[PDB]
Structure formats: C-alpha cells, structure tokens
Amino acid sequence: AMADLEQKVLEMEASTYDGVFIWKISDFPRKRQEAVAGRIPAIFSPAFYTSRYGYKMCLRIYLNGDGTGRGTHLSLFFVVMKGPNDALLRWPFNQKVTLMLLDQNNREHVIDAFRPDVTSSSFQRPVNDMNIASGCPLFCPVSKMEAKNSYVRDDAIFIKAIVDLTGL
C-alpha cells in the first residue's frame, strides 16, 4: 500500500542524474554505535545516475570500517546497481569515481578517487540488484571524523560522490 508508494517517492526525491551525489547521514551517533556494536556494520545510500538514462549507482559506508579498516577507519564504497537501461550501456563500467567526506567548515575535505578495475566483478553488467561494492576500506581514520573536527556537525555527516562523465 502507501508504504511502497512512499518508498518509491523517497528514492525519487534523492535521485540525481548528473553523476554528482551528496548523501546526508543523520543520527550519526546512533548509527555509529550500531556499527561499533557489530549490529549494523554497513549502510547503503539512495540511488543516483550518470545521466537521465545512464548507469544506476549507490554508495555503501561502514561507520566503523570494513576489512583492512575494520575498527580503525570509516570505509566508503561505490556500488554499481542493475539499471533500467543497462542494455544500452557499455560494460564493464569504466568511469573515474571520486569520493569525499565533507568538512562542514568547508576547509579540509577528505577525498580519494579511483578508476574501476575492468576485470573485477564489481564493474561488470549487474545480474543482481547490486554488484559487490568496491572502493576505499581505509577512506578516513575514525579519529579524524567521528571524534571531532568539522566533519560531524549537529549529529550528521555529508558524503559526496562525483562520477566522471568522460565518454558519456
């Protein structure tokens, strides 16, 4: 019922179609604890696109880290999702991706970037709703964010992703 329609409306409200996405994560302290406790290690973000009919993507974050960054870092990953127009798109996904943790003093943003590994299952045409997430396990030391600084303000953080559109 209205629950499924409300859900669709929510996704539409967050979608962008220019490869630029800003994900505001509220209730930081709580979600942060849920991660540290091991109850909810990760969180997926709403979907966004490279163009009106481009690739469908989303972000995946671990407030207390994943893999090599477990317990010491904020881990941030990129996710290629099964899009409505994947049949018209070139595969594997090969666009540069830039990830950022925004400094709310607008000073020192945490930034990193990578170009896809064309041979990884993470960038092949999706068979499932989401491909394996790929990105930065050591994106940012917990001490750098969470702790203090201007990354966490009014119990929220902002993550930004920029997908280069060269060739698209």
Binding site: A42, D66, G67, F77, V97, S122, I132, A133, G135
Partner: peptide, 7 residues
C-alpha cells in the same frame, strides 16, 4: 579499488 568484505 578494493571490494567490501560482507556484501
């Protein structure tokens, strides 16, 4: 890029 471990 490196893949996540539990997805």
């Amino acid at each position: 890029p490196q893949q996540a471990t539990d997805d």
